[PDB]
């Protein structure tokens, strides 16, 4: 006979949350990744200096002169950050993150410019030789959709 204004408006806010759910869920993940990136960076300094001073990429965190323990460079969404031959990889925690990005990671690696180096940011990579890296293809890479426009670099970016 009457009361449908309360019933529809409680059910439009319910469906509004369902539509606002995936937007906040990638905005959210995309936000948790943007930090793995910040934790990865700022460690470029150590790595850059080590390379320019010696001409060899730092083998591990201790070589680079950073928390000798990968797990000591963690965060809220970051379970750690390891330096492996100049390549700095950031791992996403398992608690406090999206759902399709946890335990997932990215990498920052550089290239000899000769007198200086240039840095790249993208999906996990392994270093082959002092001037070549390759996709750490394995299935734990953070999905392209979660990576900034500034971190879409490919293993062979120059």
């Amino acid at each position: 006979f009457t009361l449908i204004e309360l019933m529809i408006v409680i059910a439009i806010v319910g469906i509004l949350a369902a539509v606002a759910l995936p937007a906040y869920q990638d905005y959210t993940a995309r936000a948790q990744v943007s930090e793995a990136i910040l934790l990865a960076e700022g460690q470029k300094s150590a790595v850059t200096e080590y390379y320019l001073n010696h001409g060899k990429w730092p083998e591990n965190n201790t070589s680079a002169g950073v928390a000798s323990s990968p797990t000591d460079i963690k965060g809220k969404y970051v379970k750690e950050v390891e330096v492996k031959n100049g390549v700095v990889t950031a791992t996403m925690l398992s608690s406090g993150v999206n759902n399709e990005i946890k335990g997932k990671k990215l990498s920052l690696w550089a290239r000899r410019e000769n007198g200086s180096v240039k840095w790249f940011c993208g999906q996990p990579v392994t270093r082959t030789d002092d001037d070549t890296v390759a996709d750490a293809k394995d299935g734990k890479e953070i999905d392209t959709k979660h990576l900034p426009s500034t971190c879409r670099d490919n293993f062979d970016a120059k």
């Binding site: 006979f1 009457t2 009361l3 449908i4 204004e5 309360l6 019933m7 529809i8 408006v9 409680i10």
Partner: protein, 314 residues
Amino acid sequence: GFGGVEGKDILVFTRQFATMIDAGLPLVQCLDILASQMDNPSFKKVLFAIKSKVEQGSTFADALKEHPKVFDELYVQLCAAGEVGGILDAILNRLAAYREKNEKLKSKVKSALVAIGVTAVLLLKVTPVFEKMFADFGSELPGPTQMIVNFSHMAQEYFFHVAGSIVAVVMSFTWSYRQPLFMPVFGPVLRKVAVARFTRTLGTMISSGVPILDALDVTAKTAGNRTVEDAIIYVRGKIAEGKNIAGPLAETKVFPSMVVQMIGVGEATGAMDTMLNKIADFYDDEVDAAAMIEPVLMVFLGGVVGGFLIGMYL
């Protein structure tokens, strides 16, 4: 392709069969009577055909099977369950109550997306919109915050107003859902529905040829409201003692001056059947039209709106 019949029209006819059958008339004679009292042809026409199968010896359930577009499988099975168990009378009473609940429920969604749906969205949020509108006229109102707080705290403090809006909604929903010490003063007495049912039942048994006193003895066993049952037992007791039908009725408030004056004419004319049939159809139409269902809306309408505005004000 054939359609059923209206919810109203199933109702009237299932009620009046349940009534006649529970009176101990033969099923074929019950069938004849409701056909002969019907106003729509399609009903009188079917019910002659259902009766034609019953006089060939078929069950009522099997006779209604000739109209599966009108009496669905669930209806026949209820009839047939009553016929198999020796309870045809009590399953027809159940079916009459069912049909009455079905028609009332139909009128009452539909009434006022149609017009009812558009008007009910529109009423349910009118106020809560006004409200969000006065609270969006800037900053530093009654009860707000400054915009620089952190959002979560701002939203939680206003929780007062989000709450006064929801309550406003729940109220206008309640009015739209409902709406479509002297111990004896507290008992539910006879309503419009219960008078309409009574009048239809009696109009029905008189038009069929039962006397007044035989119809009242059946009716006094099939009246649902207890206070009316007590009223009708007193009316029947008075009439059986030799008091005039209009005089037993005139003692009870539920019968208006006219119902009594009209019945009083029917006693002297030998036309009580005709009188009761027209009384009943007048009442059935008054019932389905049905003024306090709209005034109490408005009480809660503006009363809740105003409660919100005062709520944050303070």
